[PDB]
Amino acid sequence: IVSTQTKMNGCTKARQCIAYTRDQTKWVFNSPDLIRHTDHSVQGKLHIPFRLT
Amino acid sequence: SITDDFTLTSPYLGFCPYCRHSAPCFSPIKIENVWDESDDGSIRIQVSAQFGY
Amino acid sequence: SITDDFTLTSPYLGFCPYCRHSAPCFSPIKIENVWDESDDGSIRIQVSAQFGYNQAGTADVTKFRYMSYDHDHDIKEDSMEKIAISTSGPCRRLGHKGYFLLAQCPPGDSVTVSITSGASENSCTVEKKIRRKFVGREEYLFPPVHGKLLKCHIYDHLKETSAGYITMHRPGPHAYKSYLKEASGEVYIKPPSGKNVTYECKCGDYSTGIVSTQTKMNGCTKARQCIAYTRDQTKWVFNSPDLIRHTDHSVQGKLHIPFRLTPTVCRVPLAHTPTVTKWFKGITLHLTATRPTLLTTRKLGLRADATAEWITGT
Amino acid sequence: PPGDSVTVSITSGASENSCTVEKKIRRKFVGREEYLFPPVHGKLLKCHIYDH
Amino acid sequence: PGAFGDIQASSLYATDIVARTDIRLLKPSVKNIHVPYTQAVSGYEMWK
Amino acid sequence: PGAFGDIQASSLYATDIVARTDIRLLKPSVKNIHVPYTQAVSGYEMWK
């Protein structure tokens, strides 16, 4: 984890590295277009409005 | 328990099969599910965006 | 050779079979040809107006030039934001160059090119069956996300590609009745201020001349016995069936037809693989199809009892 | 255009309303040949239209 | 006319194109300048 | 699969739901993240 520029070590191309931010913590839908966390446990539930009455 | 606190949740980017330019793209309004069981023609749409907040 | 000098060319007025008022009229946006051979549903539209160029003929992506109804053969320029293509609903504009437009259009029975605002608000509707086109042996509404890549031919969005040429011809005469007066029982020739007008009269005998002022004519009792046109115009025009040709109709130049049909690869659906039930000397195919899918069979012996079916449903 | 209903709307203002009734508006042609819109070349046939 | 090969050429860029598509030129009826014509359908399209 | 009763349960809110809907998971092809799948139709809809 870094907070400024870092030269790294022995990397010649950028495709050998990935960088992400862990600041995000707001829950998201169980969508097929997102890569899941290492802990894909149900953190909460949200209502589905407009009940069939 | 089911929560109504959307400060804990966040919208996301999906993969829409058909964007404005007639090609797939990453979109903030990806349509996940469509439900049409109403007898008066109304439909329920799920979108990666959050409305009313 | 094929030139791209649009300063040498000019737009013209066609005869659209369906103007805004649902009647034939003379239009600056007449549709000459419509081509739909693209596997992605794009069409090529030829218009009497020139798009992507300003009044002088220089390149300007935001401007289109057209022929005015004014009796001075004027060329006016307006913004391309007023150009709308529609078939049943609005179409997406993919490119423009010269007389040619490229549009992504929904299916319909007509093609409409419109000037949506301004003094020269007009429309041109020609009859053309734009249908839904798909590649391969399985129907789709739009290309899927997951599938196999197949060879398809589409219209290149780049205007620097050519699919042929169109012939440029010298402009013909254009007689205007604004040049005739018919004061009391005599006909007067009215040139448009500082311009030279050539007249032709059959008032007993054939009379012709180039004039720059009021002319009394000879023995002309009615204005229908004389015509008057201006020979100043020299900019080439398309070989259109709505203009009277010049005495010399040799090919003066050639213009490119943009948006060439190029080979590319499309994404086509892969159907649900069937369940095969095996019995004595035969199979049963439990086939799931949401949209029409092709089932082709043939025996691998002397006689191939070929079957071809379009299957929808389970 | 052809359709299955007729709608009259006030498109803005305080009295912004609408009204839809069910009526089959079909495509009408004159003579023994079908067309989308009248052609440019043809013959002249007696037809009855609504005076503007 | 109306059949496959109603238009024939030795190549695509040849100047020896031969065709028989039943082009009937009609007498103009409207005042506006017009060449009215009627033609058979494309034999290529019909064969397609 | 494809017939009435392809999904069964003792109740609507039961935790012992049983199904056989012929879910085939396909190899991803596009570069974007994708779970590609194909499935039979709803036997409930076919029976309706």
Next chain:
Amino acid sequence: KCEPSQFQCTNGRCITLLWKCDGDEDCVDGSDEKNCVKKTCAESDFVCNNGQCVPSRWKCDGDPDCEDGSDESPEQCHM
């Protein structure tokens, strides 16, 4: 004579009704235009004080054109 589908010139040859009162002279003596009440002037057509339909270019061109001369009056176009 000819059917009501055609309007007779005052010459003997009859043109169709679509060509009558259409702003275009298609009678040899003009008997298809100077009878109907289509007195409207075009968008670019100047109107005399006498009501004649004269092209806008004809206004203050230096020579009288319209019957009353309003096209060349000093009041109507300053000189």
Next chain:
Amino acid sequence: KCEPSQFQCTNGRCITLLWKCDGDEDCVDGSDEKNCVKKTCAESDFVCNNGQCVPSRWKCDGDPDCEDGSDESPEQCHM
């Protein structure tokens, strides 16, 4: 080799023609990118004085980005 419907990188693998010339580095040596005339540079992507696409966030962040270092130039950002 492989069919003309694919692009052969200078490694031994061919990817689809659409994957070439589309903004992503697909071959191990990036051959699918460093060949085209795709000089279009994104809306959020600032264009350096040397012609290179550099994201707007890097602009005068305190560290040089471009070959000429135009991002840190005091003319670009007052400091």
Next chain:
Amino acid sequence: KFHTVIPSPQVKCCGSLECKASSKADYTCRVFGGVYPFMWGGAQCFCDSENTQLSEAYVEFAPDCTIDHAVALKVHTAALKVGLRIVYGNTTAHLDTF
């Protein structure tokens, strides 16, 4: 698919036009006797009923025919070329024969 080319009409006010011969595909030429044509601007001929119009129509190759075209061929006797993988002893030979 053919593309119908209708050149600009030729009109002669008081005079007659002749149908000439051209080598283009399905060249149809006809002459009509009295027309009195109109463009935007009124009548284009001074002559009352002696106006002659010349209509030309030939066909060409549509611009998209470089892709959507069919080739008609006549095929004579067919010949069989086989590839073999003969294995004799512990040697494998790959050869192509007629």
Next chain:
Amino acid sequence: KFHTVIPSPQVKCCGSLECKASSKADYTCRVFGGVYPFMWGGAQCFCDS
């Protein structure tokens, strides 16, 4: 009518993933060999295949 729940995909960038057994209705699991997936922001792994 059934609702097909497709969970968020799991990717391991340099390593192997194993199918597990779950009691949900018609639980199908498959493991694919070389992916290199892309999101809005580029590649999500550092390995190549």
